Design a protein around this ligand. Structure first.
Ligand SMILES: O=CN(O)CC[C@@H](c1ccc(Cl)c(Cl)c1)P(=O)(O)O
Ligand SMILES: [Mn+2]
Ligand SMILES: [Mn+2]
Lengths: 379, 359
């Protein structure tokens, strides 16, 4: 009954909330491993003491002089912890490229993979899928957790559409003329060394929803032309599934990541008390409006990248990362982010091949960065 | 496989929509029986000509007051759709349950009045609800295991008198109040709360009601983790009808899906329970149990008919229900037979008829 859980990226927001859910539920879960990057060593050490878990990894080569009591340390240390720790669930909340090999290791162990790491699916694609058994991957992000829940409303052949909700970002309702000369700071993105301003920027450009559509297709096996996005400013409905009879099943809750976290850890069994439920003691309004696709082409661009297939979704994300960073540095304008992604994709015919190995993914990403860097330099 | 369907109350809104679902899906469904009252005789005759079904209850093979019941007894069927109105539905419900066939239940009276009697007559999962709220709940319940259900949340339109005060209600006419009258009085939601308890076996203090004027969300299930699963569609009874007949399989093209190409707002607000106490009274009646929900419904039907005859005001409908229920001390006994139910209803009608005459 007690599930053995490895928490990768234990020091970030998702990691710390999962440990909190586990801490509140020692009857359901037992932490058996922790991993984090060398920059976060001090927090990891505090976590070792608090949990009593000695099976810990420093996920990279950093903090090299401060390692000497850490059982795994070095570039692929998180992957080694996963390969070597008996577990029922691996929560992968590592950020970026660090998350991919641990994902593949996790799947090869036969454990459930509670996946928070976006690169795993977006860059890894079928490399990751080929390693998974049906139902082995359970998503942690709000939208995908909602979808996994709503898909219980019928059989796979009864599914008509998957409908992701989107907040709309800071620029919901704005015209293309209005967005021509917006600044990073106006996007809510105040550039910092963390992923925060980049996540915020992705929300503003709708690239994040583009990424989520890609993940939706890979997770649930639904064609891109049946994955819709609806703007829903309140973010109470986290996503929905429309079935062949006209019925839509939606999942709703006040925003709290502990709900989808708990469900991913405990799948298929729900975790009593993870989050507060919707309260109807107060009058409220849930609004829905179409996405302005002419103004926010990032989502359709993701569909194009996804339809092309293979390493094309890795290209999409790597191109975004470069174009986005350039916008953060004041080197390009806002509309050029998605303009550059499209330019890079148009030049990327060699990268539609399905990845045979991790190196294929890494090669596609390196090529995409170079291409984006050239595109940036030319304006 | 192809399912053989008997449609009781074929000439009404539900029945005709059902026949349309069946005609659109000849590979899934086949009509094998039709039952009608007598008012819309022209429709029944037209239905016979289109379906070819001669096995009809009202050269009519089954006539009388127990005709629909006897149609059920002797026809080979996989599904019986009971869309009859009121008292005419009780016996056909019990007879359909006796055949072992699936009961696609639209007639509220059967469950609400019969209660435990109907439940004893039923095997697990034999009753599949046609009601939009209960169809929604059944689908949303797929979101977890029975042990993970925290609450069932029924949505209510609020009726045309949403916002109105007790004084405002004093001056409504039969045409202003428009089932539709029960919607307006909130007695419908009272009846659906009882129905929900009996269908899904959830305590009354874990069945909530929220007013949702758009009627897009048809109901919701909240689970122990804090997740709420909701069912949404443009208002169209063909959806829950199609699902009831083909349960657990969904029927392609049954209804239009929610279309998000145009902006919309789904509003939620608390029920004004002081102006609309019908639901709390149904909880009182349901918790008391036994024959009390038969009393609840019969008291309504009598008080509602008085309003429709112009004999009483609108706020008197639910007022009389409360009066009859408070005198109903004796009726918190489980009905052993159909006659116990009919005695409860007679008692309720007469006590209601007195209240009407007293004022
Ligand atoms: O199943 C439906 N009913 O029982 C009708 C009554 C409820 C209702 C449901 C949907 C619509 Cl669009 C309308 Cl107008 C009315 P209620 O008014 O009790 O919510
Ligand atoms: Mn998300
Ligand atoms: Mn209803």
């Amino acid at each position: 009954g007690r599930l053995r859980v490895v928490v990768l990226g234990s020091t970030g927001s998702i990691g710390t909330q999962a440990l909190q859910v586990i801490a509140d539920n020692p009857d359901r879960f037992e932490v058996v491993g922790l991993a984090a990057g060398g920059a976060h060593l001090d927090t990891l050490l505090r976590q070792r003491a608090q949990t009593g878990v000695t099976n810990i990894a420093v996920a990279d080569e950093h903090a090299a002089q401060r390692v000497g009591d850490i059982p795994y340390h070095g570039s692929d240390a998180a992957t080694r912890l996963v390969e070597q720790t008996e577990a029922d669930v691996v929560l992968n909340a590592l950020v970026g490229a660090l998350g991919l090999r641990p994902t593949l290791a996790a799947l090869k162990t036969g454990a459930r993979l509670a996946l928070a790491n976006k690169e795993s699916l977006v860059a890894g694609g079928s490399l990751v899928l080929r390693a998974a058994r049906p139902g082995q991957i359970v998503p942690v992000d709000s939208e995908h957790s909602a979808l996994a829940q709503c898909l219980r409303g019928g059989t796979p052949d009864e599914v008509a559409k998957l409908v992701l909700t989107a907040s709309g970002g800071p620029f919901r309702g704005w015209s293309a003329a209005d967005l021509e000369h917006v600044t990073p700071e106006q996007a809510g993105a105040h550039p910092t060394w963390s992923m925060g301003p980049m996540n915020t920027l992705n929300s503003a450009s709708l690239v994040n929803k583009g990424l989520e559509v890609i993940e939706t297709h890979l997770l649930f096996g639904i064609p891109y032309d049946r994955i819709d996005v609806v703007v829903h400013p309140q973010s109470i409905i986290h996503s929905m599934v429309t079935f062949i009879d006209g019925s839509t099943i939606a999942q709703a809750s006040p925003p709290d990541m502990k709900l989808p976290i708990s469900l991913a850890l405990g799948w298929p069994r729900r975790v009593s008390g993870a989050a507060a439920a919707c309260d109807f003691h107060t009058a409220s309004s849930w609004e829905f409006e179409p996405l302005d696709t002419d103004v926010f082409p990032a989502v359709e661009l993701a569909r194009q990248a996804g339809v092309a297939g293979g390493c094309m979704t890795a290209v999409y994300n790597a191109a975004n990362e470069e174009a986005a960073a350039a916008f953060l540095a004041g080197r390009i304008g806002f509309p050029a982010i998605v303009g550059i992604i499209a330019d890079v994709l148009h030049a990327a015919d060699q990268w539609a091949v399905e990845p045979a190995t991790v190196d294929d993914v890494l090669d596609a990403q390196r090529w995409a960065r170079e291409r984006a860097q050239r595109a940036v330099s030319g304006m």
